[model samples]
Target chain A: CPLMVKVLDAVRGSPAINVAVHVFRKAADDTWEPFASGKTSESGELHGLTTEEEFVEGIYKVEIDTKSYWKALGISPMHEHAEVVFTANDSGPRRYTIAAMLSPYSYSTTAVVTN
Target chain B: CPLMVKVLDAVRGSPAINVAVHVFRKAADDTWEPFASGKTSESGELHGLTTEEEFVEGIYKVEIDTKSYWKALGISPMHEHAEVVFTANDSGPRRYTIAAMLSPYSYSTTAVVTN
Candidate 1:
């Protein structure tokens, strides 16, 4: 897989499950076009999001639906959602994983790449 | 003070020291206007980035310099920097602490807010 995601809930201090992820690639005119999407698994991982061939060189945005993730647990969150924007595949094809931590009033995310 | 930051190095499993933080506010023209800046302490916290009065309701961006951090450690990093953007002071004045986790190839973060 070319891309994957991992999510954590700080309040729960455990892996966040069922977080929805929407992947988008930047268009030439600077618009975002939908590419792929998925949900985190039992281990808080959204795996096999894309293949190397389909994950061409470009700027990509990964939007994680945080509100629903919290509301489902009957908790109110501060931010409606969180997104990560990054440039990928320019240097070469590699694996990418987005590690995110969540809270009702705050959220943070970072990208991890592997060969 | 309204905003503070905490950075961690996942690889080291310890608080990241001396990570530079640059704060910016969204201008009417959609450009980012510099607000304040600081460096993480030995405890990996950047305190007093902004005051409650100056931190009016708006979209703000917090940029963390990961390049210099890793380079200082004699390691190569994937991303030059990482940033967090969010709306603040919308509901009311509150204390916000951004908890960021970092690795050479990965980073994660979340916000902890207090009354």
Candidate 2:
């Protein structure tokens, strides 16, 4: 749908690893749903699953699996894969900004409010 | 021996689920390792792995599998399970304060420097 913005952008320790993502959708009833799944590019960006925007009105989430991804690199992890939990508080005609870091032992994500 | 500190403390969404935790340890070489693993109590606390404190001097991590945890509650995930990354900068006579919240759609964690 509106995949025009860069959801995640950052410089991580390593590349050439597989990435797995989990998307969470916050409902009005205060519940969560697995809305989407994706993998990161060689450059560490994640996107996919055409069903993402159908219910993009409330709070949603996107998670990346960095452990198994990094373990593929033959290194033991020090921190768990980083994760980003963002609040899509607005369902307007604006863009959403997301970012994440992937490393052998850590993963972190931050979402910027789009103007 | 130091099973004395409550690593996680807070009110989360649901209970009665299997919680998986990933512990990360920061090495002096500036690397992270999957140092430990454990499950949360009915009250949302995580602990275990006697091998955890042997190398608990530097930056370490504790991750909660909240998606699967809440999923066992029959609720879809809104936000990814809560994650907590903290710095145990002191390997001396000090305590670590860790806390976490589990919800169907959202989770948050904070560490208080214990005096």
Candidate 3:
């Protein structure tokens, strides 16, 4: 399975342009290791972060650095950051897409397993 | 301070009409007690779930029964349900508004404390 992520500003109802997105793979020891990291584009999207190549099946966490994005806009983000967790399966159509809608004082994320 | 919630269908870009919305108050023992439950209006909103008087400071969880809603539309919900956890404080402006955008396979939420 492969993964893609998108970020948006809920209040403005637009993409969260240039925001930072990071993905972490969970280790057997219960720790997390960074799998990929990047910034959103003008459309507030990060595609092919990990799906272009074959990957293992396990739990992964995706974190968005909202603080930095809001800070640059001279506002305080309600969440220092935001994250979502999902399990990747090996035997299925695993095109996963995680999207988050964020504002200075709140944020939410959703994930979908697409074919 | 009081609380209000709104639900919508993300893909359709419209309100989630007649969907069920429930709120639970966290107990000291870590169990959750139902505080309120209702269905969304034609406009897809539930206002004044709590507030308009006095309440304690603690954590509260809001859940949306998405499966039932999507099932009626002949689709399966990605999440059987969706939930958000937030701490309510007695001080400051506590008009809390939580909103969720959901499709069959994805959902996102955002919260804000207003005056």
lDDT of 1 by residue, A3-108 (tens): 9887878886556888899999999998999999999997678998889889999999999999999999999888889899989888898678777888899877
Task: List TM-scores for all candidates, in order.
Answer: 0.54, 0.41, 0.53
lDDT of 3 by residue, A54-82 (tens): 55788889998999988988887678999
Q: How close is candidate 3 to the true structure, as a TM-score?
A: 0.53
Query: What is the per-residue lDDT of model 2 for residues A1-115, given as tens digits with 9 covering 90 to 100?
Result: 4321122222222232346767777777888777777776654455444333474666676656656665776767765556555555364643443444344444444443433
lDDT of 1: 0.84
Estimate the TM-score for candidate 2.
0.41
lDDT of 3: 0.76
Pick by TM-score: 1 or 3, better one: 1
Question: Which ten contiguous residues of candidate 3 chain A have the minimum total lDDT?
Answer: A90-99
lDDT of 3 at B69: 88
Model 1, B3-114: lDDT tens digits are 9887878675456889899999998899999999999997678988878788888888889999999999999999988788888788899777776788889776555555
> What is the C-alpha DockQ of each candidate?
0.05, 0.02, 0.05
Q: What lDDT tens digits, residue by residue, belong to model 2 across residues B6-113?
A: 222112212323467777777778777777777766534554444334745666676666677556757677766566665564646334434444445454454534
How many Å off is the CA of A56 in candidate 1? 0.6
Worst 10 residues of 1 chain B by lDDT: B106-115
